[PDB]
Design a binder for this molecule. Structure first.
Ligand SMILES: Cc1cc2nc3c(=O)[nH]c(=O)nc-3n(C[C@H](O)[C@H](O)[C@H](O)COP(=O)(O)OP(=O)(O)OC[C@H]3O[C@@H](n4cnc5c(N)ncnc54)[C@H](O)[C@@H]3O)c2cc1C
Ligand SMILES: Cc1cc2nc3c(=O)[nH]c(=O)nc-3n(C[C@H](O)[C@H](O)[C@H](O)COP(=O)(O)OP(=O)(O)OC[C@H]3O[C@@H](n4cnc5c(N)ncnc54)[C@H](O)[C@@H]3O)c2cc1C
Ligand SMILES: Cc1cc2nc3c(=O)[nH]c(=O)nc-3n(C[C@H](O)[C@H](O)[C@H](O)COP(=O)(O)O)c2cc1C
Ligand SMILES: Cc1cc2nc3c(=O)[nH]c(=O)nc-3n(C[C@H](O)[C@H](O)[C@H](O)COP(=O)(O)O)c2cc1C
Ligand SMILES: O=C(O)c1cc(=O)[nH]c(=O)[nH]1
Ligand SMILES: O=C(O)c1cc(=O)[nH]c(=O)[nH]1
Ligand code: FES
Ligand code: FES
Ligand SMILES: [Cl-]
Ligand SMILES: [Cl-]
Lengths: 306, 262, 306, 262
């Protein structure tokens, strides 16, 4: 069909993928529609050990956006392999799962990447290098091409499935990091993770998030996502799963003009639980409006424009 | 069937106290409502404000196909302010009903029910008193407000029989001067089930006075995003299973007191 | 009065300052209200020679924001000293003017900073180091602490008025640059300039801005501004003029909780021409709502919290 | 006096052609209108869309205190789409009147006026024909559209006397098949003043055919932000003074042909 796109590890019936941290492991939104409509799902970050996350308040509203400071709350590798992914496998055996992998040091990332491909339904790993590294002073793996390339290369060695890297946008120049990550063996990229914002309470004069700083997302960041997706697409040959503020089939198509191959939708699910099926059934009419063949073609036409 | 989301119609909206609006909503979400104390996840009519506003269900009318809510607004930059500018006839984007409400099944006419409420914690307690009244149990309802300016639902509670209703104000402008906790100390009987909802200090004082009671049901608040349990924004620490997070939107909004640390 | 704030070179009757590039040289909005209501004005960037700017389209709408790629269009030093600033001086002799100074190489910045203090009404210079440097390959002066400190030190030498530096937010870590700029002799800071975004036309599949990339501003960026203003305020002692998406007295006050001393308002003027007088007359009621004395106090209370 | 901005009232709004809405606005901005071809800077009722939408004045009625505009909408994500959902009674945030319009002072009943318009360039030309008709000059009005589906203001132009009106469509669905330029070649007289407005290719063809005429007035478009001349978003290169920028919102929207390069 028109909406189908084929990526490393991913034979997607269409390009819509709920973004990590915005869909749990699918168990909640599944009460609202048949998850088989989706192309895939980036499930919540998996860390080696369980994590409660940060203290509350964890989220805040901004203009056309929100802030989150969840802190990677997740039940850990053992529980995710035993409960959460098998649950997806039973109810949706043919629905490819993208396993977001986060960590605090290189060994932890590698340990997760060794085991988590064993899940039959996990077709891809999305390395979330947008975390603090304690083996480096809380610096993010996603800001140093050398460390990031180390991390990917180490993780590339143990993984039974293709490895995508999820780029942080909080950089001066993003091009060295993508070049480095592609040369370390990444099969694909996802971008972007969140920007950094703060809100203050007028009454208490303290930050509204306990964590002070939090990740900014929503339509407010779509221009930043488009710019960095366009920037990286001129510099790497591995395909890009674009995300950042997508709310419409129009937004999806614009991600394609930037060079994305599939589109992840994250914050928008909170406003409209049906936004991901809504967009999918709305995509063909919008593609006709702008004279587009198939998404597989568009990827090639845009790639050759470029 | 299980609609989950609907464009409801505002039947009316008026300002029933200082910055507190009562909105009556008509739609088919009402036939899905059961336990008192569930909430609605309301979208603001302002495209720059994407997160829904969670507001307790005050009462509903299954035959009329309408439910009622009572909410406080912020300043002119607040999203609830925008909601109050909506008018009779307008549609409003609603998710619901959502959450685990107040259990009322195992209550019977012999056990004596105490209900404590404050501020904008009062609305969900009204539907609770409606459904408990049909069980012919005896109710004591103690409500506290900051002031007479913010007093809500007095006439609705007074009209319920089997009710001893007491009202406090922090300044004394109406009823008893002081906080709801003062009226709480003054009760002389053995309470079998307590339902409570209000500002955290009030919930803290209620939970500490009755730490020994199993049937103590506490209605909680938190910052929300998804409203259905997927983003993990609204967590509480589980007292019964350490390191385990309770989610106010999905596990709650009401918990047993054994499950919470304040 | 309550709204008055005193800064280096700036005895402001209140803190509202229309942001550079959003007010021209005041001649247009002056048809709409008495400019004397304002605390000051950051006028358009001055470069040594005239500049036409970039080709059109130069602006684009985003969610709660806009993109601009003006290209520093301005009539140049000689005309600005002879026409545009004297015009302000005649119609508003007591209205302090903040002279945004941009450039393409270090000599140009210095040349402008030597002359432009000669204007009686120019009390401060706002070094716009968020430009490309051709003496470095189009890299921005605002991304290298060494070069930026060079540029400020060179410019500090020739200026007859206090020098504020305007920080770019497109950095991995902003703290080295502020530390460097404060140690180079800057009397103050303004932040932030714009983020980088892109929009694509669905019909043509090309970027909607001729310049491809453009500066993102508006309420969409207020959380990013607050975070970087809060970050820098813990690291420098020179005062900060905060800007980024301010539209309300509430927004102004939040900038204060972050550590700003006065607030510049830029993109908002395009939606509401009266937004800067509107905010100024609305400020005291909003300060009462949140129990605030005077802005001079609030600066001190926030500074000591911190 | 010189109000500059006002919350006007929508008197009516209906869809008079495929995706082209006619809105009639009542307010005191109308008494400030003079030359035809000024525009309004409209705010979208959508807080996430901060830039105003600039739309030409089609006609006004000074006594009725109303003006009329005709605009095309985009898709459901477009801001003009949102404007069309507004309804009779609603207020809309307007800046105006803005710009330099079409001069009509120096026109007298002997000189022969040609008017060329296309697409959504037609609306501002209607007020122009109204005010020229009072000078009893002879008018030839040639309008071109993409299709019959997007034809606008035919009945209003037909009702004006001293008018020879011709209409083309690119597909031939109505009137003459082809572009407005074809009808332009076919005129046989000496034109003294030409007023024109429409898509850039049409303006390009008009300006090249009459490069020799001083009284050739061209109505321009560009991307806008501030709408009053301060941000320099909407520039055109000045043909009469190189390196000098014309601003479509403030110097324009209408220019003499000597001032433009297409
Ligand atoms: C389960 C539940 C039931 C509730 N029931 C009611 C009710 O019946 N009546 C009532 O007046 N209020 C109720 N609240 C609180 C109510 O949600 C806030 O008053 C409202 O969301 C504030 O948003 P705003 O538009 O007023 O302010 P804004 O400052 O514009 O809101 C910005 C963001 O902050 C969040 N936020 C700010 N303060 C609070 C708070 N105290 N609690 C939760 N979220 C907050 C908002 O939800 C929103 O996501 C309830 C909260 C919860 C969690
Ligand atoms: C002086 C002037 C007079 C005009 N008069 C009319 C009129 O009478 N009738 C009419 O239908 N249209 C007119 N236009 C064009 C009109 O402004 C656009 O149709 C409209 O702004 C598009 O915005 P949107 O909400 O439809 O789309 P969106 O894509 O949501 O708009 C996003 C941004 O892009 C800008 N934009 C996109 N396309 C155009 C364009 N072709 N021209 C200008 N800005 C654009 C918008 O102004 C806005 O700032 C006029 C333009 C100008 C400059
Ligand atoms: C509440 C929340 C939780 C998130 N959790 C994660 C996460 O666990 N791992 C991750 O890589 N990204 C996470 N993100 C980033 C999203 O995956 C997404 O890339 C980002 O929010 C931008 O897209 P959006 O604007 O459509 O949400 C989270 C975002 C939000 C808002
Ligand atoms: C059209 C436009 C032109 C601008 N021109 C300049 C400029 O010449 N010099 C400068 O330092 N900043 C310029 N800026 C950045 C603003 O000064 C302001 O700092 C930034 O837009 C953030 O604030 P805001 O979101 O309130 O506009 C410009 C911004 C816009 C939108
Ligand atoms: O869990 C979080 O707080 C989180 C992780 C992440 O990768 N991105 C984000 O915005 N939030
Ligand atoms: O003139 C511009 O394009 C410009 C300059 C600047 O400093 N910031 C900006 O956003 N735009
Ligand atoms: S609000 Fe998303 S988990 Fe409770
Ligand atoms: S729109 Fe701002 S200068 Fe013309
Ligand atoms: Cl861990
Ligand atoms: Cl120069």
């Amino acid at each position: 069909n028109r909406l189908s796109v084929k990526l490393p590890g991913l034979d997607l019936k269409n390009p819509i993928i709920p973004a990590s941290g915005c869909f749990g492991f699918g168990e909640e939104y599944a009460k609202y529609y048949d998850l088989n409509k989706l192309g895939s799902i980036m499930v919540k970050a998996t860390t080696l050990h369980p994590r409660f996350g940060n203290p509350t308040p964890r989220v805040a509203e901004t203009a056309s956006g929100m802030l989150n400071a969840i802190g990677l709350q997740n039940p850990g590798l053992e529980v995710i392999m035993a409960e959460k992914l098998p649950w997806l496998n039973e109810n949706f055996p043919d629905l490819p799962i993208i396993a977001n992998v986060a960590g605090s040091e290189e060994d932890d990332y590698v340990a997760v990447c060794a085991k988590i491909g064993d899940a039959p339904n996990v077709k891809v790993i999305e390395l979330n290098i947008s975390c603090p590294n304690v083996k480096h002073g809380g610096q993010a793996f996603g800001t140093d091409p050398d460390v990031a390339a180390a991390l990917v290369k180490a993780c590339k060695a143990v993984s039974k499935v293709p490895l995508y890297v999820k780029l942080s946008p909080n950089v001066t120049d993003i091009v060295p990091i993508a070049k480095a990550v592609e040369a370390a063996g990444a099969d694909g990229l996802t971008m972007i993770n969140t920007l950094m914002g703060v809100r203050f309470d007028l009454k208490t004069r303290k930050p509204v998030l306990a964590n002070i700083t939090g990740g900014l997302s929503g339509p407010a960041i779509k221009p930043v996502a488009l710019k960095l997706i366009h920037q990286v697409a001129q510099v790497v040959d591995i395909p890009i799963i674009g995300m950042g503020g997508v709310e419409s089939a129009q937004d999806v198509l614009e991600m394609y003009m930037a060079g994305a191959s599939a589109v992840a939708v994250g914050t928008a699910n909170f406003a409209d639980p049906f936004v991901c099926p809504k967009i999918i059934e709305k995509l063909p009419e919008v593609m006709d409006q702008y004279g587009i063949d198939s998404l597989e073609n568009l990827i090639q036409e845009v790639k050759n424009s470029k | 069937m299980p609609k989950l989301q609907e464009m409801m119609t505002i039947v009316s909206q008026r300002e029933v106290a200082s910055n507190i609006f009562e909105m009556v909503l008509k739609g088919e979400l009402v036939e899905e409502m059961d336990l008192p104390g569930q909430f609605l996840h309301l979208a603001v009519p302002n495209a720059s404000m994407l997160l829904r506003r969670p507001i307790s269900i005050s009462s509903w009318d299954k035959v009329a196909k309408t439910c009622t809510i009572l909410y406080r607004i912020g300043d002119e930059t607040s999203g609830t302010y925008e909601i109050s500018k909506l008018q009779s006839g307008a549609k409003i984007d609603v998710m619901g009903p959502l959450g685990n409400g107040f259990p009322v099944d195992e209550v019977v006419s012999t056990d004596k029910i105490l209900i404590v409420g404050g501020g904008i914690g009062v609305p969900p307690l009204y539907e609770l008193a409606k459904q408990l009244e049909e069980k012919n149990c005896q109710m004591t309802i103690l409500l506290g407000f900051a002031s007479e300016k913010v007093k809500i639902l007095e006439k609705e509670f007074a009209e319920l029989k089997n009710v001893s209703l007491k009202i406090a104000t922090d300044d004394g402008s109406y009823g008893t001067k002081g906080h709801v906790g003062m009226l709480m100390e003054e009760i002389d009987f053995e309470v079998d089930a307590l339902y409570t909802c209000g500002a955290p200090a009030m919930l803290k004082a209620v939970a500490k006075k009755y730490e020994q009671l199993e049937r103590l049901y506490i209605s909680m608040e938190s910052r929300m995003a998804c409203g259905i349990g997927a983003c993990y924004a609204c967590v509480e620490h589980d007292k019964e299973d350490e390191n385990h997070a309770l989610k106010v939107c999905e596990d709650g909004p009401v918990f047993l007191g054994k499950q919470l640390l304040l």
